[PDB]
Design an enzyme around this catalytic site. Structure first.
Site, PDB file in Angstrom:
ATOM      1  N   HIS A  37       0.949  -0.970   0.063  1.00 20.22           N
ATOM      2  CA  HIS A  37      -0.189   0.212  -0.013  1.00 20.22           C
ATOM      3  C   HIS A  37       1.257   0.885  -0.010  1.00 20.22           C
ATOM      4  CE1 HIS A  37      -2.981   2.506   0.710  1.00 20.22           C
ATOM      5  NE2 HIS A  37      -3.603   1.927   1.070  1.00 20.22           N
ATOM      6  N   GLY A  38       1.272   1.999  -1.672  1.00 14.53           N
ATOM      7  CA  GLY A  38       2.062   2.759  -1.262  1.00 14.53           C
ATOM      8  C   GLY A  38       1.375   4.234  -1.503  1.00 14.53           C
ATOM      9  N   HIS A  42      -2.110   7.044  -0.876  1.00 16.33           N
ATOM     10  CA  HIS A  42      -3.647   7.438   0.002  1.00 16.33           C
ATOM     11  C   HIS A  42      -2.839   8.439   0.174  1.00 16.33           C
ATOM     12  CE1 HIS A  42      -6.177   4.344  -1.786  1.00 16.33           C
ATOM     13  NE2 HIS A  42      -6.975   5.064  -2.881  1.00 16.33           N
ATOM     14  N   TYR A  52      -0.478   7.280   3.138  1.00 16.39           N
ATOM     15  CA  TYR A  52      -0.117   6.633   3.776  1.00 16.39           C
ATOM     16  C   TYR A  52       1.772   6.742   4.192  1.00 16.39           C
ATOM     17  CZ  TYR A  52      -5.171   6.124   4.634  1.00 16.39           C
ATOM     18  OH  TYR A  52      -6.483   5.873   5.238  1.00 16.39           O
ATOM     19  N   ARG A  73       0.879  -0.566  -5.165  1.00 13.39           N
ATOM     20  CA  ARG A  73      -0.463   0.621  -5.119  1.00 13.39           C
ATOM     21  C   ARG A  73      -0.097   1.402  -5.024  1.00 13.39           C
ATOM     22  NH1 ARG A  73      -7.149   0.098  -5.628  1.00 13.39           N
ATOM     23  NH2 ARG A  73      -7.118   1.651  -3.410  1.00 13.39           N
ATOM     24  N   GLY A 110     -14.504  -1.344  -5.003  1.00 15.42           N
ATOM     25  CA  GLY A 110     -14.227  -0.460  -4.022  1.00 15.42           C
ATOM     26  C   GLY A 110     -16.308  -0.956  -3.254  1.00 15.42           C
TER      27      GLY A 110
HETATM   28  C1  LIG Z   1     -14.787   1.722   3.649  1.00 19.03           C
HETATM   29  C2  LIG Z   1     -13.377   2.169   2.251  1.00 19.03           C
HETATM   30  C3  LIG Z   1     -12.364   1.271   2.576  1.00 19.03           C
HETATM   31  C4  LIG Z   1     -10.887   1.367   1.594  1.00 19.03           C
HETATM   32  N1  LIG Z   1      -9.778   0.458   2.915  1.00 19.03           N
HETATM   33  C5  LIG Z   1      -8.898   0.913   1.669  1.00 19.03           C
HETATM   34  C6  LIG Z   1      -7.842   0.219   1.903  1.00 19.03           C
HETATM   35  O1  LIG Z   1      -7.013  -0.483   3.149  1.00 19.03           O
HETATM   36  N2  LIG Z   1      -6.531  -0.029   1.655  1.00 19.03           N
HETATM   37  C7  LIG Z   1      -6.224   0.839   0.039  1.00 19.03           C
HETATM   38  O2  LIG Z   1      -5.342   0.862  -0.789  1.00 19.03           O
HETATM   39  N3  LIG Z   1      -7.680   1.342  -0.656  1.00 19.03           N
HETATM   40  C8  LIG Z   1      -8.546   1.439   0.246  1.00 19.03           C
HETATM   41  N4  LIG Z   1     -10.139   1.702  -0.094  1.00 19.03           N
HETATM   42  C9  LIG Z   1     -10.275   2.494  -1.354  1.00 19.03           C
HETATM   43  C10 LIG Z   1     -10.372   2.177  -2.628  1.00 19.03           C
HETATM   44  O3  LIG Z   1      -9.181   0.694  -2.308  1.00 19.03           O
HETATM   45  C11 LIG Z   1     -10.985   1.729  -4.151  1.00 19.03           C
HETATM   46  O4  LIG Z   1      -8.991   2.455  -4.788  1.00 19.03           O
HETATM   47  C12 LIG Z   1     -11.858   2.909  -3.923  1.00 19.03           C
HETATM   48  O5  LIG Z   1     -12.883   2.399  -3.182  1.00 19.03           O
HETATM   49  C13 LIG Z   1     -12.545   2.560  -5.458  1.00 19.03           C
HETATM   50  O6  LIG Z   1     -13.393   3.231  -5.680  1.00 19.03           O
HETATM   51  P1  LIG Z   1     -14.645   2.269  -5.955  1.00 19.03           P
HETATM   52  O7  LIG Z   1     -15.371   2.665  -4.744  1.00 19.03           O
HETATM   53  O8  LIG Z   1     -15.828   3.088  -6.687  1.00 19.03           O
HETATM   54  O9  LIG Z   1     -14.576   1.210  -5.960  1.00 19.03           O
HETATM   55  C14 LIG Z   1     -11.200   1.828   0.592  1.00 19.03           C
HETATM   56  C15 LIG Z   1     -12.951   2.656   0.608  1.00 19.03           C
HETATM   57  C16 LIG Z   1     -13.441   2.712   1.052  1.00 19.03           C
HETATM   58  C17 LIG Z   1     -14.737   2.998   0.828  1.00 19.03           C
END
Ligand SMILES: Cc1cc2nc3c(=O)[nH]c(=O)nc-3n(C[C@H](O)[C@H](O)[C@H](O)COP(=O)(O)O)c2cc1C
EC number: 1.3.1.42
Length: 367
Positions: free
Chosen positions: A179-180, A182, A184, A231, A325
């Site tokens: 996980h690289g 958002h 973090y 990512r 997601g």
């Molecule tokens: C409730 C929630 C939790 C998420 N947790 C993570 C995570 O732990 N790691 C990560 O890389 N992205 C995380 N994401 C981002 C999602 O992986 C993803 O890129 C995003 O949901 C994609 O758009 P979509 O919801 O329209 O499919 C999260 C998103 C949501 C909505």
């Protein structure tokens, strides 16, 4: 084109996939006290498909890596044992599953840190007050001032990643994803809007890409390139993770990934990139396609995808796999629905990070 390319097979390294709809990594906070719970087994199993690829919610690589409540970890013997039962369940449905290794860096709070210590980052700069942290009691809070780590500690965090990757294989995971993104820890090193360092890990693109390169190299060395996904999200500004030139950053990262693949004699499982979401959409589409064209390997696009947008990306060669997601939160059988073009269930943001094993977790209905 529309005869659904999402259902044409794909070879992601050594994993033969039957379709291209991927479960995106999503934090749901049901792993009480950082231990994977049975509920996780139920949740992932419901979404698993024969030949489908799932990526787990972010998972802790150390006691200091969390920023959310009840997120699972994979740095202890107890956690590996519990993850195992979940992986077996998913494997029994014939799915492929990767564990995402996540370190929040400065995006944490004393309540999430051992002995209420401050969170670590490349910088001493705190996320601004425009962003708030979800607290154990459901309220929000303030992100504190992080502690800028030195290079010796940077190497220790790298080892935390390497040991976690080995623990993931031990649990039976097919691989891991870094996980690289958002904003973090890794993105705190990548983004020039955060990385204000004057040592060999800051300044130029090369220095700012050093941390992610060492992290990917260590995990590749430990479990094999073919079992490592990476990512990133250069164009997403979450938690003040902005960069003066998103596309230049994205291409510098791909360049390091192509180099890791060449020097190892093997390709990574994939590069997974998250898109922001008209002059703005076209532009982001151009950025995505350019980082794709530049990467010598499998590309997973994510961010705001629907059935129509996913079909298009694959048909147009913009990506080989599409991760979903939110729609995957509320549609356990999303893959089947996309296949039949059956109606999709709405999702409830209110229960995204609550702790109940069923409510808003495994109780969304199948068709
Ligand atoms: C409730 C929630 C939790 C998420 N947790 C993570 C995570 O732990 N790691 C990560 O890389 N992205 C995380 N994401 C981002 C999602 O992986 C993803 O890129 C995003 O949901 C994609 O758009 P979509 O919801 O329209 O499919 C999260 C998103 C949501 C909505």
């Amino acid at each position: 084109d529309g005869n659904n390319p999402l259902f044409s097979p794909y070879k992601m390294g050594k994993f033969n996939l039957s379709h291209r709809v991927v479960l995106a990594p999503m934090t749901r906070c049901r792993a009480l006290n950082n231990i994977p719970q049975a509920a996780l087994g139920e949740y992932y199993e419901q979404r698993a498909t024969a030949g489908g690829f799932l990526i787990t919610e972010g998972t802790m690589i150390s006691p200091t890596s969390a920023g959310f409540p009840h997120v699972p970890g994979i740095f202890t013997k107890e956690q590996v044992r519990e993850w195992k039962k979940i992986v077996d369940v998913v494997h029994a449905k014939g799915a492929v599953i990767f564990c995402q290794l996540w370190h929040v860096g400065r995006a944490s709070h004393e309540v999430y840190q051992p002995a209420g210590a401050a969170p670590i980052s490349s910088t001493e700069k705190p996320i601004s007050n425009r962003w708030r942290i979800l607290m154990p009691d459901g309220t929000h809070g303030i992100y504190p001032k992080p502690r800028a780590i030195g290079t010796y500690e940077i190497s220790q965090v790298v080892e935390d990643y390497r040991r976690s990757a080995l623990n993931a294989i031990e649990a039976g995971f097919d691989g891991i994803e870094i996980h690289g993104a958002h904003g973090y820890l890794i993105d705190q090193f990548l983004k020039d809007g955060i990385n204000d360092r004057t040592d060999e890990y800051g300044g130029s693109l090369a220095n700012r890409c050093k941390f992610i390169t060492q992290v990917v190299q260590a995990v590749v060395s430990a479990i094999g390139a073919d079992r490592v996904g990476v990512r990133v999200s250069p164009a997403i500004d979450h938690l003040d993770a902005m960069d003066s030139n998103p596309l230049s950053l994205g291409l510098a990262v791909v360049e390091r990934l192509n180099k890791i693949q060449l020097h190892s004699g093997s390709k990574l499982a994939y590069l997974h990139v998250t898109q922001p979401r008209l002059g703005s959409e076209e532009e982001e589409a151009r950025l995505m396609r350019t980082l794709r064209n530049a990467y010598q390997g499998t590309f997973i696009c994510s961010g705001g995808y629907t059935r129509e947008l996913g079909i298009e990306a694959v048909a147009q060669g913009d990506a080989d796999l599409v991760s979903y997601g939110r729609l995957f939160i509320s549609n356990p059988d999303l893959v089947m629905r996309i296949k039949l073009n059956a109606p999709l269930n709405k999702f409830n943001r209110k229960t995204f990070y609550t702790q109940d094993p069923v409510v808003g977790y495994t109780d969304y209905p199948f068709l």
